[PDB]
Amino acid sequence: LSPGEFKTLISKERKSHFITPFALVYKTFCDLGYDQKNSDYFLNNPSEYIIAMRKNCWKEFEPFEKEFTTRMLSYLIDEERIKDMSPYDAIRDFTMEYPTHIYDLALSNTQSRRSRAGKEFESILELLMMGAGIPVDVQGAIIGKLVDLVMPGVVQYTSNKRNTMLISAKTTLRERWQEVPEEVNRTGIREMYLATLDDSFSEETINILYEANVVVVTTVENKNFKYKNNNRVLTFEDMLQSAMELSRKWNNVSYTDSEKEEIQQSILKQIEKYSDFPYVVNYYRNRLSALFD
Template identity: 30%
Template sequence: MNGISSSDVLAEFDQAKKTAPKLFRQYGGRIPSGVELTRRAIDEALGQPPYNTEYIKDNFSSLVSDLQLAAYGYYLQAEREVCGEALAAYVKGQSNGDTAADALQSLQSSFFVLDRFFLSLTQSRRQRAGASFEEVVQTLFRALGYPYTPQPELSGSRPDFVLPSLGHYDAFAADCMIFTCKRTLRERWRQVVTEGLTGQAFYLATIDDGISRPELAKMKDRSVIVVVPKLIKENFYGGQLNVISFENFFDHHLDPAVARWTANGVISG
């Protein structure tokens, strides 16, 4: 094929694996962080803090769905501009002329670098999407003023929150709630629910609409309750008792716990 030996192609591929990450790092750093883009989406939707907490609580499901999509859209816009510029500059730098044939030849010779570049881009995109979802949920959650300790170290696990506090968890773990966010679950819920972790229940917030019934059954056996936007609950998990909406979580799980903690003097009223 064009007189290129197998060993030459392998060497070209190995070199591309070194060149593409450098190219991605050079330009990827110009894309705003997921936190920045998420805050932009939140500020545009809700204005500047302090937020209307009653509105957030009543519309938590739609806000989670809409805001994480808006933040992801901002990321894709920045990605297209920055990475498009990177690819154009790279291909132009590899070209030996200005004709269309030269450009096509440059694209062909750059195939492996572009392939590795897009692989890095895809991996970054997945990470950004997950970070955007988590930032939206956490920002809205914080805005509602519930008591919690963020990112606690619990028996080798690090969930997003323990409620009402790490101190109360150490004193009476069964009276606490553990809450964390993962845009998609698959098997990753096991990262949060370790063998040594104790608590009243584990709440996993997600927008994953493809969790299988056998997997949900395993999660139920480990006291895992999946928290999703209302429409995902209605359309995909209608009969699953350990899948609830965000609104159900606040009204029937967290608010009663807050009332109990207040009555017992665990938190101030």
């Protein structure tokens, strides 16, 4: 009933009532039929896939968040307080009595939305690479924690970063793009792709990132609308082509017995992470099977 206890309640209810960002992305991926599309589809249509995935995730989330918000706000309506108030004075009281509650709820909502938007964007990209058939290790499933996807895998990367691809994602950049050169420079990363839906980043940012060997990747629509001229801004289609070309380099490479068991271990860990997601397990198990192929 206090602003404090209401936070704990919002917390408890959120966790109960919302599936994980990745579970939502996976649900949506299968619902939109992407789980039956061949790898060429993802290779050829990554920008449209991303936007459709984004659109549907939000379409499903937003009526649900609205009702969760309405419901939260209802664990604090006080029928006994508001006995003989007029409807106007009733609403008046509400806007006066529970400012920290209302605000804390909306605060918890935005903080969830921010965390989830990033996590779902990463998950969307992750499934994109999987759908494309491209060997990746997912950061949060197995190099700074800022990298989301390591192609073909951390084991191979750790051995030698040649012919690899590292992809990070930020739905919008603000000044937070500055984090990426920091991480690139901290670990000696050769280059990083920085996937974004941001329509507003500047040329000065692009050039600083360029100097730091961070490549911005966005949708064709965003690129053609806002960065048409600009060969420093890539599309997801460019990226996916690059990833596809580099993945042919990992195709029938023979690992030493030692690296092979490390790759297996890494894949096994990720299958574990993605235990409840047949499409992803299947994706990893093909990679596992590829080592004995």
